[PDB]
Ligand binder design. Structure first.
Ligand SMILES: CNc1nc2cc3nc[nH]c(=O)c3cc2[nH]1
Ligand SMILES: CNc1nc2cc3nc[nH]c(=O)c3cc2[nH]1
Ligand SMILES: [Cl-]
Ligand SMILES: [Cl-]
Ligand SMILES: [Zn+2]
Ligand SMILES: [Zn+2]
Lengths: 369, 369
C-alpha cells in the first residue's frame, strides 16, 4: 500500500524540481496544479472530467462547506470524497483566508477569528473541520498579512501565525486517525521582508511539517515583487519537502515560480475566468465573447488535446457564452483546466529532460508575442 | 444506406403503436421523447450525455437561433448538427410558436407574422430557416390557436393554418436538397371542436405529409380535455404515418397520449424543471431543495440506471441546487432526461409484449400513490 506521505524528487534543473508525492488516496505528480473545488464541486465539471484533464489532486475550499452543509454533516454523510465523488487526494484550506475576504464582520484575537457569514474559527477548530471533511493534506491555520505591511505589523502578524502553526501541529497530532492518514503543511509569512521570512521558515522547520507553503503573496504586490520575494524565501524552506505557493496563478506566474523552487499551485483563474469567457491558449489568453470569434471554426487552441478542442469551435463557444448557456461554462472550464494541466505536464517533462530553462523562454516568447 | 424517411409499425395494442422511423442520420424508436435544444444546446448537457440517456432525436428550437447567430450564419458554419456536435436527427420547430410567446410586438397577416425580438416570419421563410439549419424533420409553419377559442375564431385560425400548410409543402418541395434529405410534418388545428379537427385532418391528408402533429393542445385546457380531444382527433390522421403531440408533457400525459395513438413528444419539463430542483421518480416528482433531502444518501430514484443515480446522493444534489452550483443543473437534467427515456423504453417494450395497458395502470398507481 502507498504510505501516508512520501515526497521524492526524480529530477532537478537549477531550483526547479520534478517528482511525486505518494499518499494513501493516490500519487501526485509535481510540479502540480490543483483545480479549486468551491462548495464541494469544481465548478461546472463532474469529477471524472476533472480527472480526464490530468488533475491528480484538487483543493477543497472549507469556508462555504463549514457553513453549509456543515463539516459535521459532511462527516455524517461519509466525508467530502464520497459526497462529491472524487476519490483522489484533496488538499483543504484552513477556512480563514475566505473568512477574512467573504464574511460580513470579523473580530481577531489570539484565540482565532470570530465572524458573521457568529462563529469562532481557531486553529483547533480549523484542523477539526478539515478532519471531519476527510482532508488528505491539511493546512495550518494562519493569517495572510495584507500588502503592503509595515515591518512592525508584518512581524506581529507572522509571530501570531507561527504560534498558530504550533497549535495546528498539536491539534493534528492529537487525533490519531488524522495523524496516521493525512499530512499537515505549514505556511511561511513575513510579507516582503527577508529577515521575517527567515524567522518564519526557522519556526516552521522547528515545529516540523510534511510540506511548506509560501503564504502572503499574490495579494496585490505584482509579479516582479512576488518573484523577488520567492528568490530568497523558497531556499529557506526544507529542500526535501514540497513547496506550495498559495493562490498562484497565471501561466507565467506558475512558470517563474517553478524556476524558483515551487512544487504546488492552486488558483481560481482557469475556472472563474473560463466562466467569464477567457480561454487560455499557447498564444496567450483570448476573450471568446469578442465578435472576432463569431465565425471562427478553429478550436479554442490549435494544439490542445482536450475534448473541447477535439469537438467544438470557437464560434460555437462564443455563441454559448454570449447566450448565457450552461454548456458554455462547462466547455470553457474543461478546456482551461486541461490547458493548465498540459502546462504542468510540459514543465514536468522539460525538467525531467534538463530543458526547462529553454521551455520557459519558449513559453514566454510565444505566450506574450 | 438508410432512406430519407420510413416509418414502420412493429407492434400494436389498442390505439398504441411501437416501431421505428428510419432517416439518413439515424433510427428513431417510437414512441419517442425529444429533449429540447434551445439556442443550439440541450441545456446543461453535452450531446454525448444526451445520447447516453437514450435519446435518438432532439428538437431544435429555431426562434433564438434565427436571431443569433442567425440561420445564414449557422449554414455558413456547416449547419446545426456540426455546430452543436449532434450527428443524429433533429426535428426543428417553425419558429412561430415562440415568436408569439417571446417577442415584444407581433403583427399577424395572411403573409405571416412580423415581430420585434423587426422581422417577417412567413411559411416560406420558416421552411428556408429550417433548411439553412439542416433540419431532418421540418415543421410546417402554423398558428397555435389560443385556448379557449370560439368556434368562429378556431375555424378562421385553422383555415389560415391549412393555407399555410400548403405554402409550407410547396416551399419544402421547391428546394431539391431539402426534399431529398429531410421530411416535412403538417400540424392539425381546430381547438377542441371535432368538426374543425376533421376538416383540418382532411386538408392535411390532401396536401400530404411525412408525419402529422396534433397542434393546439397543452395550452391551458388541462389533461381531461386534452385526452377528450385526442380521443377523436388522432384517429382522423393517417394511421401509417407518425403522430406527434407538440409540447407534451408530464409523464402521465405521455402515457395517456400513447394510449390514444401518439408516437412522438417534446417538452421542456425535464430540462427546465430539473434546473429548478424537480426530479422525476417512479414514485412521482420530488423537489430536491426540500430540507428532507439534506441527509438522504439514496439516489434521486431507487431503480434509475442513469449515471447520476449510480454516483451521487440526494443529499449532494440538494446541496448543489441550494448553493446555485452549475453541477446541480447538470446532474438534475441528466437524470430527468434519462428518466424520460426510461419511461419511453418501458412504453415501447410493454407495447411490443402486449402488456401496455397493464403498464399504464401500474405506472399510474405507483406514480400517484
Ligand atoms: C489569490 N491569492 C492568494 N490566495 C491565498 C491564500 C492564502 N491562504 C492562506 N495563507 C496565505 O497567506 C494565503 C495567501 C494567498 N494569496
Ligand atoms: C407547451 N405546449 C405546447 N407547445 C406547443 C407548440 C406548438 N407548435 C406549433 N403549433 C402548435 O399548435 C403547438 C402547440 C403547443 N403546445
Ligand atoms: Cl471557481
Ligand atoms: Cl430547457
Ligand atoms: Zn482545449
Ligand atoms: Zn437517475
Amino acid at each position: 500500500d502507498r504510505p501516508r506521505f512520501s515526497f521524492s524528487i526524480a529530477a532537478r534543473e537549477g531550483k526547479a524540481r520534478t517528482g511525486t508525492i505518494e499518499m494513501k488516496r493516490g500519487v501526485i505528480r509535481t510540479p502540480a496544479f490543483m483545480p479549486v473545488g468551491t462548495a464541494a464541486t469544481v465548478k461546472a465539471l463532474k469529477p471524472e472530467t476533472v480527472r480526464a484533464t490530468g488533475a491528480d489532486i484538487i483543493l477543497g475550499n472549507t469556508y462555504h462547506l463549514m457553513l453549509r452543509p456543515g463539516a459535521e454533516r459532511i462527516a455524517k454523510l461519509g466525508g467530502l470524497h464520497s459526497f462529491m465523488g472524487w476519490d483522489r487526494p484533496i488538499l483543504t484550506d484552513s477556512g480563514g483566508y475566505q473568512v477574512m475576504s467573504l464574511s460580513s464582520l470579523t473580530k481577531q484575537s489570539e484565540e482565532g477569528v470570530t465572524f458573521k457569514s457568529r462563529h469562532m474559527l481557531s486553529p483547533e477548530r480549523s484542523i477539526e473541520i478539515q478532519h471531519l471533511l476527510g482532508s488528505d493534506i491539511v493546512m495550518a491555520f494562519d493569517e495572510c498579512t495584507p500588502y503592503p505591511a509595515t515591518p512592525s505589523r508584518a512581524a506581529s502578524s507572522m509571530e501570531r501565525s507561527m504560534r498558530w502553526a504550533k497549535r495546528s501541529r498539536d491539534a493534528f497530532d492529537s487525533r490519531k486517525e488524522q495523524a496516521e492518514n493525512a499530512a499537515l503543511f505549514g505556511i511561511q509569512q513575513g510579507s516582503v521582508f527577508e529577515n521575517l521570512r527567515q524567522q518564519s521558515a526557522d519556526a516552521l522547520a522547528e515545529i516540523g511539517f510534511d510540506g511548506y507553503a509560501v503564504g502572503g503573496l499574490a495579494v496585490g504586490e505584482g509579479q516582479d515583487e512576488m518573484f523577488r520575494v520567492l528568490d530568497f524565501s523558497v531556499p529557506m524552506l526544507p529542500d526535501d519537502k514540497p513547496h506550495y505557493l498559495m493562490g498562484v496563478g497565471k501561466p507565467d506566474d506558475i512558470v517563474g515560480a517553478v524556476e524558483r523552487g515551487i512544487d504546488m499551485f492552486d488558483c481560481v483563474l482557469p475556472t472563474r475566468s473560463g466562466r467569464n469567457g477567457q480561454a487560455f491558449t499557447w498564444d496567450g489568453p483570448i476573450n471568446i465573447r469578442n465578435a472576432r470569434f463569431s465565425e471562427d471554426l478553429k478550436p479554442l487552441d490549435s494544439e490542445c488535446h482536450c475534448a473541447v478542442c477535439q469537438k467544438w469551435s470557437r464560434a460555437y463557444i462564443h455563441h454559448l457564452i454570449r447566450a448565457g448557456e450552461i454548456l458554455g461554462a462547462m466547455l470553457m472550464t474543461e478546456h482551461n483546466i486541461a490547458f493548465y494541466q498540459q502546462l504542468m505536464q510540459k514543465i514536468r517533462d522539460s525538467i525531467s529532460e534538463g530543458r526547462f530553462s529553454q521551455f520557459a523562454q519558449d513559453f514566454r516568447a510565444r505566450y506574450f508575442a
